[PDB]
Amino acid sequence: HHWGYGKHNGPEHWHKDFPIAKGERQSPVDIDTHTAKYDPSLKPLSVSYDQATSLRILNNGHAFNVEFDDSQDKAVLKGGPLDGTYRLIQFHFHWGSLDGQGSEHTVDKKKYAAELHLVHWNTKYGDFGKAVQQPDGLAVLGIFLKVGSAKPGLQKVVDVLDSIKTKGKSADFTNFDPRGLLPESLDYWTYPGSLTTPPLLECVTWIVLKEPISVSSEQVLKFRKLNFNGEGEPEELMVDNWRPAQPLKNRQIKASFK
Ligand SMILES: [Zn+2]
Known part of the structure; x- marks a missing residue:
């Protein structure tokens, strides 16, 4: 038995196994755009993803992760509110059962x-x-992802999901370029927060991009065909694997733009 997003084990239950769920710097949060503080001292983001090495895609029972080689400085994030060099280890998504929900962060409750x-x-x-x-x-x-036009650079991910439908399945996934997932602008909001899944550790500097990318209804439809369950178990579609907004408490959200 274990945490998840269902009725009996979803986010409202996590605090019993992970008391930090009611902590002081939990994520995600609602970004109130009129209360966010423009900070001129914030630097532009530096994304250096030209030498990224993807390795594998994995259904871990709660999302799917695209994993990278992080044994060297190949794909790094620098600048912005950060000090030092941060290496890319994996990306994943959170999504809904319906187009009107699925993100973790919200913007003016959107x-x-x-x-x-x-x-x-x-x-x-x-x-x-x-x-x-x-x-x-x-x-x-x-x-953020909004539904509209298709995203060409996402299609290689969508086409492999059939091979990792159930929990614990993985597939080789080399030569994927994550630059194809970025919006045109790198303007952002930033605040100190946490992982949004157990163990919910408060170790994260969040950098949330203002500009959404667009994906098509057919692309996001294929996300919704994955399963939370393992092969041979009763089928439960992998949908609504998002945590709702948490209280901001004693934090300020800063904006890199006005
Ligand atoms: Zn996440």
Whole structure:
């Protein structure tokens, strides 16, 4: 038995196994655009993804993760509110059962159809397991998805999902370029927060991009055909794997733009 997004084990239950769920710097949050503070000292993001090496795609029972080689500085995030170099280790999505929901963050209470998380860890801590124990250990780039036009650079991911339908399945996934998932503008909001899945550690600098990317209804439809369950178990569609907004408490959201 274990956490998930169902009626008996979803986000409202997580605090019993993970008391940090009611902590002071939980994610996601609603981004109130009129209350966010423009901060001129914020630097532009530096995304260096030209030498990225993707390796594998995995259904972990809660999402699917595209994994990268993070044994060297190949795909890194620098700049913005960050000090130091953060290496890309994996990206994943959260999505809904319907187009009107699915994102984790919201903007002026608006929900998007899905949210992309590019997860990076701070190289000064040596490995990902050490980094998540540190308040400045991770940086996650969050990108909203809206339904409209198709996203050409997402199609290679959509076409492999049939091969990892059920929990624990993986497939080789080499030569994927994550630059094809970025919006035109890199303007962002940032705040200190947490992982949005157990163990919910408060180790994340969130960088949430203002500009959404567009994907087609057929693309997001294929996400909704994945399964939470393992092969041979009763079928439960992988939908609504998002955590709702958490109280902002003593935090300020900063904007890189006006
Ligand atoms: Zn996530």
